[PDB]
């Protein structure tokens, strides 16, 4: 049966260079125009170069016009992504696609096989402590804990040392200012707070934080 | 031109969805349609607007009307709760569509909890604001978020983050605001605003 395998996937600097590679087999692959498409976290599926069956044409998505070129070698059944200049942004899984129309009829038909993927993830950031902020008001009552810009993964939020635990929502993390920004928010009876205390726990090792903040009308 | 579609669409078991298409010169191409999983690669589900490939169910079929396309799964099962993206062209480039997640309900629906909590005095210090609203209890499990500055929509400095599965199985996800402290300063209305299943619910800080 048909398949693309992909590999050459990484984690690099802004600026540098990889290559992925879409190793084919199961049809004429020469017959075929062949994509790359990519799908950044939790984004939809976004158009990168296609190279047509012959490798007489190749077109880019606007996006990485200048920066990634897309070739073929039809003597080993192999499609590459040559990825240049990368960018945070470029940060994504990247699929190889192969079309279902032979030939000239290459753009009609949609794509019928796709690799699995191989990501690619470029950042320059260090280790970053974050700063932990208290999330307040202006019957039951909302109160939070904003922890924002840290790096890398992993970080640990807790509520009162782990003794509160009922009521509470901590959301994924979100990439921002090319940093990660993290939230809990935790629920509680409007008798209960201020009256008694609450206090958000954050442990983040790879800067040595470990922080407990106390939330204040 | 781009091609749009509805963020989210939601039937029953046995119901027919209905997911469509449009842009400005999609009449004049064909339109194919891809399900995509999580964690899996896309698959072509319907091509030529309306042609399912071998090992396609015929639950599976596609029409297209002036410049929109629709797929269409008749009798729906809990296995094509899938993310649905329509595909064509344009003068020099291949277009996809944004994506539709297909929920087939397991559950009754939910609208959003919304909480707009307001920069601490701390981060302020540091010449930075941040505002989180909190969107919890939701279902199906995709919303919009909208916000607003003095009554004007915001295009800029907001990351929201992909909805999770909460214990009792609903959804949640948070948005964050981050303006410099003087912006923070200069306006008196800040607003979030949450789609969901096509009724918006606001939660507004005002000074």
């Known amino acids: 049966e048909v398949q693309l395998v992909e590999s050459g996937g990484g984690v690099v600097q802004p600026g540098r260079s990889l290559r992925l590679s879409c190793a084919a087999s199961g049809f004429t692959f020469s017959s075929y125009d062949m994509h790359w498409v990519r799908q950044a976290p939790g984004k939809g599926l976004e158009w990168v170069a296609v190279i047509s069956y012959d490798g007489s044409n190749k077109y880019y998505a606007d996006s990485v016009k200048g920066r990634f070129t897309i070739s073929r070698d039809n003597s080993k059944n192999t499609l590459y992504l040559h990825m240049n200049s990368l960018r945070a942004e470029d940060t994504a899984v990247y699929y190889c696609?192969?079309?279902?129309?032979?030939?000239?009829?290459?753009?009609?038909?949609?794509?019928?096989?796709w690799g699995q993927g191989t990501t690619v993830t470029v950042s320059s950031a260090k280790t970053t402590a974050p700063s932990v902020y208290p999330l307040a008001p202006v019957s039951s009552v909302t109160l939070g804990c904003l922890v924002k810009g840290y790096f890398p993964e992993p970080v640990t939020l807790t509520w009162n040392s782990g003794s509160l635990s009922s009521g509470v929502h901590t959301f994924p993390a979100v990439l921002q200012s090319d940093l990660y920004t993290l939230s809990s928010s935790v629920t509680v009876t409007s008798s209960t707070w201020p009256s008694q205390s609450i206090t958000c726990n954050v442990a983040h090792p790879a800067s040595s934080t470990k922080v407990d903040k106390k939330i204040e009308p | 031109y781009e091609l749009t579609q509805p963020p989210s669409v939601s039937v029953s078991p046995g119901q027919t969805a209905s997911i469509t298409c449009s842009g400005d010169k999609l009449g004049d191409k064909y339109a194919c349609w891809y399900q995509q999983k999580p964690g899996q690669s896309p698959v072509l589900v319907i091509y030529q607007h309306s042609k399912r490939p071998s090992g396609i169910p015929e639950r599976f079929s596609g029409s297209n009307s002036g410049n929109t396309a629709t797929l269409t799964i008749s009798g729906t099962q809990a296995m094509d709760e899938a993310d649905y993206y329509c595909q064509a062209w344009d003068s020099s480039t291949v277009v996809f569509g944004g994506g539709t997640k297909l929920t087939v309900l397991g559950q009754p629906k939910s609208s959003p909890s919304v909480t707009l909590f307001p920069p601490s005095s701390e981060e302020l210090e540091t010449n930075k604001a941040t505002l989180v609203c909190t969107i919890t209890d939701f279902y199906p499990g995709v919303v919009t978020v909208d916000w607003k500055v003095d009554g004007t929509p915001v295009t800029q400095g907001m990351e929201t983050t992909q909805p999770s599965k909460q214990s009792n199985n609903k959804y949640m996800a948070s948005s964050y605001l981050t303006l410099t402290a003087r912006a923070w300063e200069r306006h008196s209305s800040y607003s979030c605003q949450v789609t969901h299943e096509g009724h918006t619910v606001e939660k507004s800080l005002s000074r």
């Open positions: 696609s192969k079309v279902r129309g032979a030939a000239a009829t290459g753009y009609y038909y949609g794509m019928d096989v």
